[PDB]
């Protein structure tokens, strides 16, 4: 066995990683970089072994030769006697979320509105909605579609970063890590909740998990699910209980990637680390919980029940699926 070196994206992940490392007795140790792309480069250089990635970043990492190893599996919708680690993953619903009180807004009137995205290059926050918008408008000028946005990872002086807020001190505006107040699923949802933006591209679970007291976070603790609507592609608005019939796409779950020569060993270590620190793990919550970070989704999404084995030793294209890959490929023609 070797140690596995995890790559943490920004300082809040680095802190959680350091706590994991200490609890694992250094079976896992930590490298940290400022962005997911830079973590992918550390992994390609062999200076880190692995990290968990949204499907859009899996595409980046997979074009560079890194491979999926285990997928996040959240609470199953339907009944299953299968253990979490063996249950097939179900994909999450990419949605566009607006305030109920913003009554005129539908999918067909998004032009010149303000948008909140998890980050450039992520599935629900970017690849799915911008791919759809490029397609529908017949124009690659997706940087001119919304009047202002927060899209972490875009040029910080551009309209795509105009709404981003940076950290406590207002430094690091638009950096694609958790120090940016509007980064990621919860940041893009907060960007809508605070009416900085008119629309947030997140996933269905984000809305549930940050409303009706499911989050105690100060910006979220008082949000009511009834105050939000989903935007459907047919131009209708639905309550957030209707995401199965009003989503933009089904996304492949976030998954751990590594170099191919390290995957088997990364997989074995992770299966053992989640037996200790995962949901009902032997030492969670007593000592450390790998899948909690007070809603901040650090290293893994907080709704993860386990990391699951993949069927078919899939390549990254197999894992993402041919349609998603082609959608990304098409959108990347614009850049």
């Amino acid at each position: 066995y070797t140690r596995v070196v995890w790559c943490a994206v920004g300082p809040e992940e680095q802190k959680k990683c350091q706590q994991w490392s200490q609890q694992s007795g250094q079976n896992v140790t930590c490298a940290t970089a400022s962005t997911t792309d830079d973590c992918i480069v550390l992994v390609l250089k062999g200076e880190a072994d692995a990290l968990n990635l949204d499907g859009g970043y899996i595409y980046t990492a997979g074009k560079c030769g890194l491979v999926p190893v285990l997928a996040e599996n959240r609470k199953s919708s339907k009944h299953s006697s299968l253990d979490c680690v063996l249950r097939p993953t179900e994909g999450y619903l990419a949605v566009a979320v607006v305030k109920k009180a913003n009554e005129g807004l539908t999918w067909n009137s998004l032009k010149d509105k303000k948008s909140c995205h998890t980050a450039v290059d992520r599935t629900a926050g970017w690849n799915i909605p911008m791919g759809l918008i490029v397609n529908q408008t017949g124009s690659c000028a997706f940087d001119e579609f919304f009047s202002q946005s927060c899209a972490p990872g875009a040029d910080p002086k551009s309209r795509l970063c105009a709404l981003c807020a940076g950290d406590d001190q207002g430094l690091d505006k638009c950096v694609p890590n958790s120090k940016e107040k509007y980064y990621g699923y919860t940041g893009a949802f907060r960007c809508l909740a605070e009416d900085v933006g008119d629309v947030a591209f997140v996933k269905n679970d984000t809305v549930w998990e940050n409303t009706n007291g499911e989050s105690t976070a100060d910006w979220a603790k008082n949000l009511k699910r009834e105050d939000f609507r989903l935007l459907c592609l047919d131009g209708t608005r639905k309550p957030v209980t209707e995401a199965q019939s009003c989503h933009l796409a089904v996304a492949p779950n976030h998954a751990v990637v590594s170099r191919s020569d390290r995957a088997a060993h990364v997989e074995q270590v992770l299966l053992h680390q989640q037996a200790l620190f995962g949901k009902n793990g032997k030492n969670c919550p007593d000592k450390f919980c790998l899948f909690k970070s007070e809603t901040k989704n650090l290293l893994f999404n907080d709704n993860t029940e386990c990391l699951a084995k993949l069927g078919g030793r899939p390549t990254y294209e197999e894992y993402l699926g041919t349609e998603y890959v082609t959608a990304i490929a098409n959108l990347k023609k614009c850049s």
Binding site: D37, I40, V41, L44, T60, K63, C64, A329, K332
Partner: peptide, 6 residues
């Protein structure tokens, strides 16, 4: 649909 970005 081609090479590694890095």
């Amino acid at each position: 649909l081609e090479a590694c970005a890095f």
